[PDB]
Design a protein around this nucleic acid. Sequence first.
RNA 1: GUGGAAAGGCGGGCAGAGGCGGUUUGCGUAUUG
Lengths: 141, 287, 275, 190
Amino acid sequence: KGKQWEAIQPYFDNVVREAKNFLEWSPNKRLANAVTVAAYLTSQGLKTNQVRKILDMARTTELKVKRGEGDIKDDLVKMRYLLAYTVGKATGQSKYSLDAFHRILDPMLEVLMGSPKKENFEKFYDFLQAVVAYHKFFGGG
Amino acid sequence: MDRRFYGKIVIKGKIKAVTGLHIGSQRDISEIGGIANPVIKDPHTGLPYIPGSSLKGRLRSLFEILVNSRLGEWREKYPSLANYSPGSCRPDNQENCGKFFNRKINRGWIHVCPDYETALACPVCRLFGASGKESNFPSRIIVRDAFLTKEWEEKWRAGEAITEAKIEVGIDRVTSQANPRTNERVVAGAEFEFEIIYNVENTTHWRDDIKNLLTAMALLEDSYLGGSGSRGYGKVKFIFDSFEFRPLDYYRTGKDEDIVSIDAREKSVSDILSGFDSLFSEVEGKL
Amino acid sequence: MDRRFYGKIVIKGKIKAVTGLHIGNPVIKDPHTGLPYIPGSSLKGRLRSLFEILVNSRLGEWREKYPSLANYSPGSCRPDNQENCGKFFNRKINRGWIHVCPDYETALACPVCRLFGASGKESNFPSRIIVRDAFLTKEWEEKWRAGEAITEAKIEVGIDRVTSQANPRTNERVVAGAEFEFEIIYNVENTTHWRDDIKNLLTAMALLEDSYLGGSGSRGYGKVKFIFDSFEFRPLDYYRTGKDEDIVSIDAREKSVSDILSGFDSLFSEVEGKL
Amino acid sequence: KAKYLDLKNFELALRLRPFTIPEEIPYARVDVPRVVLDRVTQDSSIYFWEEIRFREKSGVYFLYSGPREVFDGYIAPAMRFLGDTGIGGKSTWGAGLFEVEFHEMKIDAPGSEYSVTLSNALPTKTPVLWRLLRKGGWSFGRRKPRMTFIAEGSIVKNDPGGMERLELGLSHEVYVYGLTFPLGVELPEG
RNA sequence: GUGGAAAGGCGGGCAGAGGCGGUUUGCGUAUUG
Ligand SMILES: [Zn+2]
Ligand SMILES: [Zn+2]
């Protein structure tokens, strides 16, 4: 239960920052780790309604990667500070749950400003939806 | 027996979603994070749109009911309404009962005349269409899918939103238990360009068949267009761009001789107002 | 069975707030224009909840006139987990109890569910009123343009008793005096009983002028004041000729309680000849 | 069980070497359902239909061996006219149409008196080993009688084949190509 | 001197019905530098 939330998180955090770039591995590794990402976010609450502004921000320019623009500067600006605004507006017991979710995406966003636009952000957006999907399967939404 | 062709009255215009418009279709197609009640959006642009089935169906279902009420006196105006009585076939499982709503789709009852000869005189199915075993009267109107106007394309380019997330809740009368939910609806005030083509097949009965289309539209402006609707989510309003006749001599030659009616700043009730003999007067010269 | 249509009684008017209103900490606003607005569900789901509570006390007086009130005792299914039983509030939505008659012919006989609509398992009776959203009026559209603030803010506090620990927050309310424009269309389907539903809808409105409209309400966040403008009828012949053959009912300076009271039967007199 | 061999593997079986079949066949005989609709009542009338559907790179070819002044004078005009009206089938639905390119192609034949035929044989004397084939054509709306051609890959010894003119009640006589296309082969004992 | 010729996979069908952003919490009290 929560004893799995203490061990598996501290097994995964040194593996998290050591692969800080979003183009780490396009093979079976980034999906195998992503289940373990939602495995220590399972024991926390992790409500999605505060993330709905961030995910729709990821949604509205996902079409704009697809022959809309070749610039994800204005979008990825808006994703960085609002995700800091997530603990920047919502604190409390949901803050200790949302600090551990902060430390995975913030190494990957700073790649995406200087990254390719057709590439390396799809490799982020596929890791985006791998965190959400299993989180519905372990019992959270 | 005897299907002819004389032209196509094309009704060009702009549907103005006065209240939040909601249609709704499938979600989660290779996609995880949504609001789980998305209005149908076409995949190439990712913008919402009003379909043709959602407009032809709601123009139909508001014109079964008008006929179902005045079924008694229109048997002289229109034959083959003497096969019918006001009511549903629901209490006894019959595909042809005495009542009006006769055809079972899956579990619901929708009026469709069973034959070509029966539907030729019926006011509903002569316009919107019909079906049967071996007889099969096909439609006359082509209601096409409506997309956003030249202006509202650019408000998606400039950065303005097009869908809003409204939170509604349910409440117990006793314990005040809040039961919330979210809806994706079109932002109120967006504007879609529709087009309704009327295939003129008989010059005997087009005046009493354009008037029926402007009766089903003039009810739709007082009713809602899809969605939750009874709680505000419809309220749609037709803004007519141009009526155009598109005659038979247009299609062979290519001359711009198509008869254009004047519908600049008129309501849908103002076309059917006394003046329908004056708006479509020059169509009588071509017959 | 047998859905029909004679016309659509249109109830235009203007909702006035003599005291400041709240919906829901911002009041929700129209995105394309920026203005706050009173929704549809907060005005149809508020009248239903001030009419299911009114019907709950009176199940002896309406049962002689309405069938399918004998099928319920005045009560609640909140302690006892049963769907359709003697208690009057029968549907557990997810966790809330809302009175919905579970059939067509129960809702055809029900006084609430023939008007505010009713779901069901293979019955699904649909409503007879459609309540539209209320934006600002065209004279109050221009105070937003003139900078006269259509809204305001409000700082309360929550006093913990012992340490006198002040715990303030900032409510955001519509300013008192701002006036909207509502819309209720009654879909006249059965000529046998529409004398009821017009005197029965105004019943739910009249309790609302004594109660609150959205927000907290027990602290000042209500005070609806329905300023009616004109009933019209819109017959079936209105949608074929397009004339002005809609019978105007004069209520330019009359109240919700001033229509339901003496003065009713002369106003709706020409509609009865039109049935 | 196989029906076709590759150009590398067809040369090996002429000399009776061990060889290999292809793994995938290029075309796929699929059957598409079509419909027949009356003009007044839009009432359906289904009928099936089936045709060869080729892949993206693939296609069909055939061979020619003879004097090039007969090639460029006759065939190379005809294969440009037949690129715009099809080789049979419902060629008003764009079925038999193609585009043409010509090439040179080399098959080594061992010198021996037996020979496989790369076309329909229609022999004058009885062949050695033959897979038989019955087909008949349609010249200008007139049915042709079924003829006993031999399928491709049968073994004749010193047989030139023939063409049989047919009457069919047309203004001109109608020939049926059955001239053999001999390439040498080594036969076993029988 | 073509296993050919002619042949619309389509006529009818509103993702719809029901649902309050909600309930409590007094811009205040405590003492001095
Ligand atoms: Zn009919
Ligand atoms: Zn009820």
